């Protein structure tokens, strides 16, 4: 018989490890374990989402006719780790083989690779065919390629999948349709939410009981936790938001946390939705005239371009990519990242959305909390931990390259992005956050000055030797060079006063 281990982000009835299962003889194992619930301090809603999705999936598999051994977080003999639980299951089931689909984090891969030796049993670790490119295929794509860029990889994925392809030509005559702020729109429909069912309510109470001090609030839990509801969330995106997806992609609004985003990452990343299925649904809408090409291509590029690319970079870069620190930063994460208590209105709103919802959209993760940590010279490892904890779609393979590469430039541009530093001028143009902020995005000195303004210049000045050759930063550096000595001095002093506030606050925390 086989022991078929399925991890919490592998919740698909067509996951590779299910190939060739004898339903009468084999047993599927799923386990809620403290090692996985504690490796970082996951958002309360993230733990509840994963455990509930796992419990519903176990019931889904039993309905399909599988034998399932399920370990709850609160079970008396819970062995505490994948290894412990597989050992318990071996003793129970006496299998001749273990089958498992390859995982999404170095830490878990290391643990899984230890099974064969630990148990003296054959362990078949299967390639995860939910991704378009295997580890070997990405490595060959990268080989001899001195400059890795998503643009190049994306073309390969378009060709491989045939998405938006007219034979060998991209639909519409260009590969990429690639920005404006949005206006409040009370006619934009609400995104779908799903009321907690019996299983979910029990999970929620358990998470509060066992993880009472974890980041985040559980109130108004509304994630889909079943395959059907995840598909309803997809349908809602196609029907209500996709047509405007491109138009508002980089916009931010105080009173509109979701805008035209899909809010599907949580489901795609744990197996409740399939990345390719999602892209195909968008493509079908395009051909029915339901959305313009810029919206549909924009959407598909984020999934078969960015998402796939980040996975490839993560595995190519190796476990010590997490130690990337191009700017040699050592500042701790500010405490307001945990509380949302800051006079910077943009930061307060984004962090509050994060506390309440375990979600923020891309340009918030990049240009608000990401940009701030970049400019404030935060230790990239501290930034990584926070992003991995606080979002219900976060797993190391996807979070880490977004943090180290795209946002923090802590890899010095390995994954092909350019530094995203921006001042209050950017945030004022792309959001309405400044409208109710105590600071003035037009001012750089004085008590009313937006903190991002002097910080932006200080970031460029302190890192000039490493960044001066960067083409994106040519104009800012030329502007800096034309500033008088006193102007430069005063900007750096203003930034230093703010960084001193951070450093003084960190000491007591
Ligand atoms: C600092 C930082 C950390 C991030 N951490 C995560 C993470 O832990 N998990 C995660 O899934 N995404 C992460 N992202 C990427 C992106 O912000 C999220 O995928 C997106 O916010 C999910 O919301 P959505 O489903 O509404 O996406 P939409 O705006 O609707 O986009 C559609 C889909 O494209 C994908 N996607 C879009 N952008 C990216 C990206 N840059 N990388 C990978 N996939 C992308 C997701 O599958 C998403 O569902 C991060 C980005 C930044 C800048
Ligand atoms: C919080 C959490 N809990 C569990 C769990 O109890 N059991 C489980 O199988 N998976 C969990 N996960 C997902 C994993 O920690 C890990 O991030 C993925 O397996 C990576 O591929 C997470 C994130
Ligand atoms: S003035 Fe500065 S701190 Fe305030 S909302 Fe605007 S960008 Fe954020
Ligand atoms: Na995987």
Swiss-Prot record:
Disruption phenotype: Cells lacking this gene show a strongly attenuated photoreactivation after treatment with UV-B irradiation.
Record-listed FAD binding positions: 261-265, 269, 359-362, 393, 402
Listed GO biological process terms: photoreactive repair
Keyword DNA-binding attributed: yes
Cofactor note text: Binds 1 FAD per subunit.
Top EC category: lyase
Binding site for 6,7-dimethyl-8-(1-D-ribityl)lumazine: 8-9, 31-39, 104
Protein name as catalogued: (6-4) photolyase
Organism listed in the record: Agrobacterium fabrum (strain C58 / ATCC 33970) (Agrobacterium tumefaciens (strain C58))
Gene name of the encoded protein: phrB
